[PDB]
Amino acid sequence: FMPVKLAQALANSLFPELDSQLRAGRHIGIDDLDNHAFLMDFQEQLEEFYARYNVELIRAPEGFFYLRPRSTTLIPRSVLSELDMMVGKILCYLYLSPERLANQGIFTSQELYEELISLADEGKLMKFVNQRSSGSDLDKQKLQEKVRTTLNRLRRLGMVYFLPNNNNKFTITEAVFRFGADVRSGDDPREIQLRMIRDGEAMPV
Amino acid sequence: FMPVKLAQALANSLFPELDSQLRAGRHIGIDDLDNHAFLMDFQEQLEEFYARYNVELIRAPEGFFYLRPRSTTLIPRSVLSELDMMVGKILCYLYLSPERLANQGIFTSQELYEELISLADEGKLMKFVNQRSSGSDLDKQKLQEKVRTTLNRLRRLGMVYFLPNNNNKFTITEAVFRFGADVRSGDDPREIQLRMIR
Amino acid sequence: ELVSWARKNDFSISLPVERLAFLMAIAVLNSERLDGEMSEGELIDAFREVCKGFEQTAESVAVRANNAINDMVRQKLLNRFTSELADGNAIYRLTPLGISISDYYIRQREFSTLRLSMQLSIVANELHRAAEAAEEGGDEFHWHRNVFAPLKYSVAEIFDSIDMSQRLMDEQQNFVKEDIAALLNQDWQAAIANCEQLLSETSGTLRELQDTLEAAGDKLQANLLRIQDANMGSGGSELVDKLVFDLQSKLDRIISWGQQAIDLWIGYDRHVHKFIRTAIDMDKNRIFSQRLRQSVQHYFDNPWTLTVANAERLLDMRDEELALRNEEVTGELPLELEYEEFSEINDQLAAMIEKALLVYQQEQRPLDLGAVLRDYLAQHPLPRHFDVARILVDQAVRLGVAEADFSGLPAEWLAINDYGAKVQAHVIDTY
Amino acid sequence: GELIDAFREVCKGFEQTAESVAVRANNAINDMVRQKLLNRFTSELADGNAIYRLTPLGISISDYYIRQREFSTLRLSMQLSIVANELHRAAEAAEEGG
Amino acid sequence: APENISPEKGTTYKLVRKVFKNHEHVHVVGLRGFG
Amino acid sequence: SSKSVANIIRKTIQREQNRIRMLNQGLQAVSFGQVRGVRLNVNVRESHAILLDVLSEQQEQHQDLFNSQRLTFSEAMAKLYQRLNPQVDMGQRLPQTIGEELLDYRNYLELDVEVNRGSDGWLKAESGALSTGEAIGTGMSILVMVVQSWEEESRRLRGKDISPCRLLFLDQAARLDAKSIATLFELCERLQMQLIIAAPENISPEKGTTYKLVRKVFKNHEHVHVVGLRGFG
Amino acid sequence: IERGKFRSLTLVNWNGFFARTFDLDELVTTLSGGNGAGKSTTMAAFVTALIPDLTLLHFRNTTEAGATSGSRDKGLHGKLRAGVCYSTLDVINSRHQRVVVGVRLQQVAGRDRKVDIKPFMIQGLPTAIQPTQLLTENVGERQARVLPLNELKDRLDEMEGVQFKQFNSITDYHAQMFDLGVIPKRLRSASDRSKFYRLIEASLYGGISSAITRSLRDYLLPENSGVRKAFQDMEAALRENRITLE
């Protein structure tokens, strides 16, 4: 009925955490460990197993895995927001950046917001939190709170984990590299985006 | 290793869609002939398979199968909102005995809307839309939009089956009894369901 | 309490690049100085040289040098001494703060564990000598000159020097961390071997330091316990206890850090370890880094958001939220609290009876329970009589005991009232 | 977790509130660490998930004032005795000429 | 009982341990006829 | 790994021994009955010292027990503890549980109290030899030493303007003797310590406030009548 | 310096206690009564108010311990009556500030014996206002009612100056209490709370009786995870050895 290795993987004690949290939109990385430490062992088996539900466990050249539902996906589809991709790219830069290695992977929402506002444009960014904003500090605080909420939602979807005693400090998954899907290759970001939407990996909101 | 019959069940061509809907939260009543029969045959293994997710595959006394999440559910839970809970009780109250005299199993959004407005207290209706509102037409429109949203949300869970058109008329499945109180011999369904709605 | 102490003290230490440079320069000159004394005529030239090698001219050399020297003096970095004969008519010297800043970088950061070994040897010798002298237990003055003055300051200084070595190891492990970080920035892939070698050698250094620490801690702890035992050789040795107290924790603390650092380091290593297989093996050529940065700078022109199966995680019936037991309870609110003199319903009469029997005790008067009970019970009604009798007996018997009890002759059941009540009691005679 | 409380106490006894306690404490600790006054060590189990220690520079600044400053000349006397002993021993060993 | 129950009815014996001339002893006063 | 486990356990035990002998100091001469002083004794238990030695230096020599598929790691530990030091031999409480207990370093230490009882010197404060009030005073002394340490530690963080509230409890105060109760009261007030004490009989009539409680059945439920009391009879 | 002082304890709708208030002495307060007088219930109610962490609370009495004292529910649910109930303590700060800390307890529904606990605190309450009166409304002749949290908030907000606060977490409850000099130690961590509860529960029992001697190790010696990690490393090595052997 099944290949030996696929049944082996499905029999692993970690397998239910993996399957369930991937169905719940969580994604695979250094954090989100229970869904990664053995999925490295059966990537092909889990991918062919998931194809039955018209969904694909996709690995980029990066070591992270994440779930993508087809158009005919049996498990229904949904998407994230622009600010989510933003915080995600900042988190990916943090993950790669060896300069902050001394942080040992632990990072604080203030560091995240500082890096985000440093790399990005404050006002053009803030246009999306609220359409009418014109540099009001109330909208800046709104953006900071929205960054906090997006970090929470990314925690729900396997990009970050709050420390047991600290919701202000967090550790990052390698699923963060999902956000670098338009930069994982030297091809154009737009043509790669077309290939993602073709492979249903990303869509504009 | 893995139980051989569990391998047979999971390899079953009907396993994918059934599993996906179960992850969604959709119940599987007797109306789903193929899913129901497959569940009846392979429950002994599928219960273990889902309990590995710390989720119980419960067959109700009504016979419909559904995934009860434990507190430790490995599939992070979403829940039916407050308006979803009361609209679900109103749906069961639209599926109980008295509806046979009024809608013969085929209901419309107007029936549910009228029952919700007449039966539910104005206080909880305002809690649904807003505490400051008072009977205004716009607030009623917002409440109706939320009613449609929760109706579709119940549709995703296989608790209401839509008639195939954009018009919001539908039938209600037996699984709706998860909302209502358990029926006892000699109990008036109206009395118990109203006491719970009250 | 120390908060206001500091607040009203009002102090500050700070150092721009030029000022800190001038500080090392003065320190080096002093290390070269004939008599260690620094005349302002040399300070001005040193400031001129450092600014020259820094190439800034805001104003005259004189004014800037004056401002700088005044700043360090006020910042408790220099001590000034007027002397008309001196060149420039003044002399200057390093303050201890300036000394501790200059040496922190210049004096060799001697991470060499042999410094730790010789320090441990010195500590063992001095500690044994002090414990020996405490065991000798001379007079109070001998106790002091052997166990506070030599012990306190010597052990404090060498514990602080050992901690200084620990802090130098701390700064060095920090340094290797920043150096690994920087090397990864410059070599990227090519830094892997260098980083791994640095981690290995740091681990070895930490292991040898831990071994050097544990090599003497246990015996030093035994020495401290010996000193504690000897400390009871003089009542006024309480202050010694405080040292005998304190020095233990310090020692333990040292040992604690000796392990703790490795516990941290070995963890940090693994992070570095994971990093190499979670950052560079996937970005071997680093191109992903610059491309990600550019995409961040220009994201909105590639508007895309990731697609997942996140439509519903697991929809379910909502809880019976906050449905609790309740009855809108009511109850008879307590009235004004009544008072009774410790069960006065019995204890007024307990005081009365204990007095009326304390008389028998005071005169050692023979107590016949039958007669006393009979005389007494008449004052109270029959339903209370039993309650009375117990209270009387619990008093009467405590007073002495009956001597006839040991004659072997049982006492009789003397009646003490009507209705048939009886008491078996020998006459209490021996109080 | 103790550094934050200490900063709160010192600012309290200084009575200044520019911003939240958290932000000011964060800025201050970062300033001393970067100023080579504190050494930071990440540790998930630790309270606040981090530990801190005095650097030798901070040690030499704190002790410059708060050490007894032992002006007691007996410290000088014992130091002179130690110097005489060690110097004689080293001169003796040099005369041994191994 | 340890006297925290000692009701009216029956032969009530009051056992009280004491040392009499170094002899361990328990004096016993009797009561009856009550109730 | 076995050697490392033994070494870390021994280091932890020694550190704790130092800390407890450290905390022992700073005790005033309490006058609970004949007990004129209190102290804490910490030592390694021989039954577990032998086991530690076997683990550190003789792990391999009983690897047969450890590789026994029938034995879990805790069961393996329990069985080894049965093999050496067979005077502790016990199997009615399951070997798994005894091994799990053995997985606690703190159990390995004997941790007892010595009391300066009269002029007899420091004697182990065994409950079968000390008057029960003396034992209660000893326990209170231990508790107050702990809370003294707690307060002293937080002395820096707290401003001196506030002296933290102090309040402990003592049920079944009837155990104590008048001497022990008076010593407790004097110690507590010297330490500005508040106390809540309970006894069947009012053993503290002349000190503090006093309440008496009586429970009555009433229409199928229960009520507690509280009555005040006053310092005489 | 004038150490702060606990003034009184109010037990509302407790098992056997409807609106009882005991005025605590400055130094020594004593409770008396024969079998089953409920003194342990009063001590338990106080300590529950002090440390509302439901997990730590497990009240086997000093004597006649265990469930038969009414503690198969951990001595909380069944030691309460059904419905709204209160446990509140007035404290005069060393700064001479009156503060009434308190906890609203409620029996949880179903066969289970869990208790819903909500901490709260009040400052600026007039010294005259007795908590018994504050926490009760006189409905019916001489048999007053007890009012829930929302009614208490309404009543207190209607009073000038008084400020009523509810803590979403026990941690902030204890932080505020400490800031008011109510706690000697900053129980920033649940472990600090655990050791605190150890000390109070041992004092409750009192002396070196069997439980106190047994748990003296826990009371004095902190837990060390180093031993646990070392043991687990040994376990993993043993497992892998067995695997290789087979």
Residue numbers in the entry:
A (entry chain E1): 9 to 213
B (entry chain F1): 9 to 206
C (entry chain C1): 10 to 440
D (entry chain D1): 50 to 147
E (entry chain A1): 1434 to 1468
F (entry chain B1): 1236 to 1468
G (entry chain B1): 2 to 247
The study reports:
The ring-like structural maintenance of chromosomes (SMC) complex MukBEF folds the genome of Escherichia coli and related bacteria into large loops, presumably by active DNA loop extrusion. MukBEF activity within the replication terminus macrodomain is suppressed by the sequence-specific unloader MatP. MukBEF is the SMC complex of E. coli and other enterobacteria. Its SMC subunit is MukB, which associates with the kleisin MukF (Woo et al., 2009; Zawadzka et al., 2018).
